[PDB]
Amino acid sequence: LCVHVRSEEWDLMTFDANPYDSVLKIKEHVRSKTKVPVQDQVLLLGSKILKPRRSLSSYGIDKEKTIHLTLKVVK
Numbered sequence: 001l002c003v004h005v006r007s008e009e010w011d012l013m014t015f016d017a018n019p020y021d022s023v024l025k026i027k028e029h030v031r032s033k034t035k036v037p038v039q040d041q042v043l044l045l046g047s048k049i050l051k052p053r054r055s056l057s058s059y060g061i062d063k064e065k066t067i068h069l070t071l072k073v074v075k
Contacts, residue, residue: 025052
């Protein structure tokens with residue numbers, strides 16, 4: 001599908017996942033990313049900081065639908 005991001009975004013985002021896992025996104029922000037300053041891409045969702053690009057399934061939909069979330073960029 002495709003996913004949309006609020007703020008000043010310079011490229012759009014898309015709802016897709018590569019044939020590994022989804023833990024690679026949260027672990028990528030820790031593996032040389034939490035230890036070094038410079039976030040390059042930060043994500044936010046319900047007053048908290050998100051580490052992947054999408055990880056909610058809170059709505060319970062199983063149909064092809066787009067989504068709109070908030071994202072920002074620093075350094």
